[PDB]
Design a protein around this nucleic acid. Structure first.
Ligand SMILES: [Mg+2]
Ligand SMILES: [Mg+2]
Ligand SMILES: [Mg+2]
Ligand SMILES: [Mg+2]
Ligand SMILES: [Mg+2]
Ligand SMILES: [Mg+2]
Ligand SMILES: [Mg+2]
Ligand SMILES: [Mg+2]
Ligand SMILES: [Mg+2]
Ligand SMILES: [Mg+2]
Ligand SMILES: [Mg+2]
Ligand SMILES: [Mg+2]
Ligand SMILES: [Mg+2]
Ligand SMILES: [Mg+2]
Ligand SMILES: [Mg+2]
Ligand SMILES: [Mg+2]
Ligand SMILES: [Mg+2]
Ligand SMILES: [Mg+2]
Ligand SMILES: [Mg+2]
Ligand SMILES: [Mg+2]
Ligand SMILES: [Mg+2]
Ligand SMILES: [Mg+2]
Ligand SMILES: [Mg+2]
Ligand SMILES: [Mg+2]
Ligand SMILES: [Mg+2]
Ligand SMILES: [Mg+2]
Ligand SMILES: [Mg+2]
Ligand SMILES: [Mg+2]
Lengths: 169, 159, 294, 139, 145
RNA sequence: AAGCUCGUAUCAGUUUUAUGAGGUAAAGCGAAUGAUUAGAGGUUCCGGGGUCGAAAUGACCUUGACCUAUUCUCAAACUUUAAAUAUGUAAGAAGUCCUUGUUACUUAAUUGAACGUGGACAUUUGAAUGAAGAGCUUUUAGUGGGCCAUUUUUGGUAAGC
RNA sequence: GAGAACAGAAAUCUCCAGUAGAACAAAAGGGUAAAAGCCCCCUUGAUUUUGAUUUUCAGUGUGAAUACAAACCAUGAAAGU
RNA sequence: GGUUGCGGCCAUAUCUACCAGAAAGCACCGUUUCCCGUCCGAUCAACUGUAGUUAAGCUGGUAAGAGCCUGACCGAGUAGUGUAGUGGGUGACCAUACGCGAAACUCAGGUGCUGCAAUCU
């Protein structure tokens, strides 16, 4: 029925798709460091694309992954910025959901003009207890059909705490 | 020009069996081989080392040597008007006990035994195989089996 | 999920070996532990299988046969109450004890137990059990870690240490025992001994005791109940070795009910399936149900 | 076919596809029989004995008109081709008695020009949705 | 060609006895276009052996003109008359190998009265000569003997 | 051509029995790859052109693309299946069984592995058929343009090519 | 496939399906999924001696390759390789 | 009979959906002093067996279920093929004689078996 299997954040992934290498990317990364309190990880370009100005294996973007109580606090901050309203897109078929903010100063965070202003993606993935089953080395398995996150279930979860609005369809 | 590399012509020969690609099961590594054993050679193309050249695919010889990872095999190959004696160093993945030497040994035992019970009864034996013999008279009955008579059938198109 | 598998996909699909499907056996490793030199004929390669469940430590000396693997002897941390240990039954110290027990146990049954003492001393210094002269070579065994990660300080090498100190020849190296310094490229045997007797659990018990009566009380509910004070962990383990060396022989559980009695209940909670005729009836019924549009 | 009986009174099907490529060597002094492998010249269908070339479906009314299409058609092909009329309902299969027993039973569902046959094999559920007519009170 | 020789048939119209079993039946199949064969009667065997029986004795081909000759080579298996020989042939039986081999290949003439067909090299079933003509071998051999 | 060593033997352009190897013929294509005719249904909530309030970030369109279940037809360099003919090995005295000797190899281990002593078992001693004797050595001639027929088969329209 | 500010067909981030439809210098064929592919850690077995063996064969050479013996090393907890 | 560890064969074992599971086991599951590894104690390491739960895993049942397996005078003695003729036919090709013999099709049945060691109302 419902005892164990509650439903929760697996992780929060803050992503700043910077777009270039050098000072600006090192500057953005500092935003994620000074926010996640972790040290962030940098992504390289999969391939060259002239009209975006990036070369393959050039570091274009930074992200950082957060878990447990701290990720839940940063999530809240974001929601605040969008005045507790997301859209019925936003939520994946497989139970996760996300949103983005422009200017990160909109959630705590002073200004330090040597840092500047960055917008950012927010992706939060939902699971239940027992995900370990699909993540562990020995006897890796798949989570049962009942169990396992869905757009319906997690939209309703999210409305129900957060006291929030989904929107549109 | 023409082309005769070592694995020339081997596309279907060294291929793995349908839905049987991948790791080779441990039985293969647990067989024991002795000098004088009779093995059948058959390449496993997933193991490129210790591999029989394709002339020896499907051929059976005698073990003449045993090594960390291979047996040496003696094959008699015909070149010209004469067999030459050939020795091969095959890894074990490519070799398999000859099953007919097994029936044979089994029968040699069976034979010794048949001989024993015969002597310890003091009777004649008869130990060698006869081939399939003609067939002795029978009486077939007709009780429930009155012969059904058939005739040839007219041509007809089914298209 | 509309990710449906075409009947062609399934039809050409080749399944992994069973134990591969079920995530238990690494076959690349198994080939290399098991396979014997061809000119050592039927000399068994023997593995020291060590596994951990969430509550038990399994220790098995196993060998191979086309018709299946064959165990020479086995020992389980669950046995350890017999010899004085009643808690931390999956901790490093128990891993060590279990490796000791299996060692003394098999080479008891091998005759080899008096010749090849082991260490008896124990300061956890790096040493293999080396062969007598003009006598039997020691009984040799190769660690099978299964799917466990080789981390420097892993429980699994505790079982290796107990079994090596037990008098088995189990080839190994220091660099995964706790106490190995990667900068130093040395092994501080002080640290390793500490683990053998549970030092890391013991020091924690004290720190927690002094810094959190409450959490100390849950994590060590047991020790509290048994009046086991912390700085007597070493005795427990030290005295446990004594016991184990004193008497490694296997005594099997005392066994209420017989294999038969077990059978007649124990999965006559087993669903029994239908005969091709009952199935037909179900078929014919289902239609009469379903027939008529909507 | 079309003028005698109408743009619509039949369905004609060319049952043979010209997959085989013919070559011409092709001589342009002259080179020789040196290197004579040809270039592609044309396509052909490799046809067998008793292998069908054309098929036509019409109404029984139109038999004679139809045969004359296929009789007029022979004069365009090398070889001996026979005009056989078939026991078989149109292009399906099943001799008309066995096709009819079926259609008067609900076992036949009209697909795109051709047709779908009720099986006793899949899931009970969706064979019931596929062939409602087959299991229904109905007349 | 090999089979013809292993059955001792290396000359036209020469003939021998074969014991039928599977290992010999597949020989007769391989050879069928080149031979005519069947089931000989006692009569036919009696007369083949009386008229054209010769034995093999240090290679040499020797006419069976006294029972002493048969006993001297076949005595060791029972078989000490020409009728002992015929009997081991017609009943097959235990020394058939050795008895039959002692008999040289029979050298028949062309059939007196002819082959009775316009063409020998088709099967008996197809209008004649070659293959197993069964009982009708007696009539053919009698005219050849 | 010269012989030599032996003498019923192990032989064999053959069968049988047993046990292997093979991917051609055929077959297949609502089975993988590749090709190919036709509709049918459903998708696009993420390619597009309209008409409906220019309206459209909204409907019903026909048109692609794609998906599902069907449909007609194919492969020397495609295939799950898979012949016939051809093809490897075996059918014992250099064998079998019992006892227990040697070693520096090998094993936890006189444990294995090899090679042996001593003891036992010869009527069919281990299918068939044949054997015009089997085995062996030296030396040397000519030849080293080939062509034809059935069948398989490649190039070529074809050819007494 | 379903999801996430600027973000677009195409940037980065989740999740699901996924028998290999990928990758493995190169032609093609074979082979491979806790790998033979991808990321990382340690390395010089691409070394020393000289024999046997398989293909091509005259059973010469050459190229290539296989399994041992005797050294000296690498790696790994180890069996091993 | 259940369950676990190590297996043999490697779908009758896989796939999809829905049920059901006593006891023990197994699991999920609590913790972060310690050895150890992460962007992230998620994985990997360690610690308790203590606070909890059969939800999942796992085991078994259901299904005119997809697949896989097996059988059959199901198709078919068909296709193809070894051998034969101074057989037919202008030819393409075909028939007969002595043999060998498929695949698809159809229908029926089936959906892991098992070795070692331990443990269990
Ligand atoms: Mg499979
Ligand atoms: Mg404890
Ligand atoms: Mg560790
Ligand atoms: Mg018990
Ligand atoms: Mg002729
Ligand atoms: Mg005949
Ligand atoms: Mg099959
Ligand atoms: Mg049991
Ligand atoms: Mg078995
Ligand atoms: Mg910690
Ligand atoms: Mg951590
Ligand atoms: Mg955890
Ligand atoms: Mg762990
Ligand atoms: Mg589980
Ligand atoms: Mg499990
Ligand atoms: Mg289940
Ligand atoms: Mg089914
Ligand atoms: Mg023919
Ligand atoms: Mg012919
Ligand atoms: Mg005529
Ligand atoms: Mg002809
Ligand atoms: Mg024919
Ligand atoms: Mg025909
Ligand atoms: Mg016959
Ligand atoms: Mg078959
Ligand atoms: Mg069955
Ligand atoms: Mg076993
Ligand atoms: Mg056990």
């Amino acid at each position: 029925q419902n005892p164990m299997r509650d439903l929760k954040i697996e992780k929060l992934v803050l992503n700043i798709s910077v777009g270039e290498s050098g000072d600006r990317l090192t500057r953005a990364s500092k935003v994620l460091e000074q926010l996640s309190g972790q040290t962030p990880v940098q992504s390289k370009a999969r391939y060259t694309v002239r009209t975006f100005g990036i070369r393959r294996n050039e570091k274009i973007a930074v992200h950082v992954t957060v878990r447990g109580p701290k990720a839940e606090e940063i999530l809240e901050r974001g929601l605040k910025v969008k005045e507790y309203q997301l859209r019925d897109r936003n939520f994946s078929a497989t139970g996760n959901f996300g949103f983005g903010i422009d200017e990160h100063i909109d959630l705590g965070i002073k200004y330090d003009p040597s840092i500047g202003i960055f917008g950012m993606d927010f992706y939060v993935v939902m699971n239940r207890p027992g995900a370990r089953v699909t993540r562990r080395k020995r006897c890796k398995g798949t989570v049962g059909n009942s169990h396992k996150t869905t757009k319906e279930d997690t939209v309703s979860w999210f409305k129900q705490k957060y006291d929030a609005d989904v929107l549109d369809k | 020009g023409k082309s005769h590399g070592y694995r020339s012509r081997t596309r279907y020969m060294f291929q793995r069996d349908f839905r049987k690609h991948g790791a080779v099961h441990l039985s293969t590594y647990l067989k024991v081989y002795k000098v004088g054993d009779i093995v059948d050679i058959k390449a496993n193309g997933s193991i490129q080392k210790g591999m029989p050249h394709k002339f020896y695919q499907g051929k059976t010889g005698v073990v003449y040597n045993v090594t960390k990872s291979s047996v040496g095999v003696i094959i008699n190959k015909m070149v010209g008007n004469r067999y030459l004696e050939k020795r091969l160093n095959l890894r074990v993945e490519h070799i398999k006990h000859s099953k007919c030497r097994q029936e044979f040994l089994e029968r040699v035992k069976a034979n010794a035994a048949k001989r024993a019970e015969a002597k310890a009864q003091g009777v004649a034996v008869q130990l060698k195989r006869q081939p399939a013999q003609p067939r002795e008279s029978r009486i077939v009955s007709t009780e429930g089996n009155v012969p059904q008579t058939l005739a040839p059938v007219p041509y007809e198109t089914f298209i | 999920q509309k990710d449906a598998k075409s009947s062609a996909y399934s039809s050409r699909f080749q399944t992994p070996f069973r134990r591969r499907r079920e995530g238990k056996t690494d076959y690349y490793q198994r080939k290399r532990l098991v396979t014997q030199h061809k000119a050592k004929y039927n000399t068994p390669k023997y593995r020291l299988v060590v596994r951990f469940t969430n509550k038990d430590i399994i220790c098995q000396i196993i060998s191979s046969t086309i018709t299946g693997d064959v165990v020479l002897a086995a020992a389980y941390s669950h046995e350890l109450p017999r010899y004085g240990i009643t808690h931390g039954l999956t901790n490093w110290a128990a891993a060590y004890a279990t490796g000791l027990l299996i060692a003394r146990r098999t080479l008891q049954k091998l005759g080899l137990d008096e010749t090849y003492k082991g260490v008896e001393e124990v300061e956890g210094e790096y040493e293999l059990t080396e062969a007598v002269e003009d006598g039997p070579r020691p009984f040799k065994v190769f660690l099978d870690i299964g799917l466990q990660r080789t981390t420097t300080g892993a429980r699994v090498f505790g079982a290796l240490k107990g079994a090596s100190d037990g008098g088995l020849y189990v080839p190994h190296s220091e660099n995964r025992f706790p106490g190995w310094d990667f900068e130093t490229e040395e092994i501080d045997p002080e640290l390793l001994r500490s683990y053998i007797f549970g030092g890391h659990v013991s020091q924690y018990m004290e720190e927690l005791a002094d810094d959190d009566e409450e959490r100390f009380s849950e994590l060590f509910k047991g020790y509290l109940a048994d009046d086991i004070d912390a700085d007597s962990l070493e005795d427990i383990y030290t005295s446990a070795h004594e016991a184990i060396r004193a008497d490694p022989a296997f005594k099997p559980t005392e066994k209420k009910f017989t294999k038969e009695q077990y059978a007649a209940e124990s999965k006559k909670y087993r669903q029994t399936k239908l005969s091709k005729e009952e199935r037909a009836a179900r078929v014919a019924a289902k239609i009469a149900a379903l027939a008529g549009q909507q | 076919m079309t003028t005698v009986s109408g743009r619509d009174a039949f369905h004609l099907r060319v049952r043979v596809h010209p997959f085989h490529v013919l070559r011409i060597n092709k001589m342009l002094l002259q080179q020789g029989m040196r290197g004579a492998w040809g270039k592609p010249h044309g396509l052909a269908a490799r046809v067998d004995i008793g292998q069908i070339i054309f098929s036509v479906r019409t109404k029984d009314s139109n038999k004679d008109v139809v045969v004359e299409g296929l009789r007029r058609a022979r004069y365009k092909f090398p070889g001996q081709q026979k005009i056989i009329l078939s026991k078989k309902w149109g292009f399906t299969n099943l001799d008309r008695p066995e096709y009819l027993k079926k259609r008067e039973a609900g076992e036949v569902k009209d697909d795109g020009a051709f047709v779908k046959f009720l099986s006793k094999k899949g899931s009970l559920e969706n064979n019931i949705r596929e062939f409602p007519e087959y299991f229904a009170a109905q007349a | 060609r090999k089979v013809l020789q292993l059955l001792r048939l290396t000359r036209i119209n020469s003939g021998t006895f074969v014991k039928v079993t599977k290992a010999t039946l597949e020989l007769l199949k391989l050879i069928e276009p080149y031979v005519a064969y069947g089931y000989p009667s006692y009569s036919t065997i009696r007369q083949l052996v009386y008229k054209r029986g010769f034995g093999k004795i240090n290679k040499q081909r020797v006419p069976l003109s006294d029972n002493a000759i048969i006993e001297a080579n076949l005595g060791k298996y029972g078989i000490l008359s020409i009728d002992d020989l015929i009997h081991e042939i017609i009943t097959v039986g235990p020394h058939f190998k050795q008895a039959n081999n002692f008999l040289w290949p029979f050298k028949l003439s062309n059939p007196s009265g002819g082959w009775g067909v316009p063409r020998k090299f088709k099967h008996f079933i197809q209008g004649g000569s070659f293959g197993n003509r069964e009982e009708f071998i007696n009539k053919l051999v009698k005219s050849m003997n």
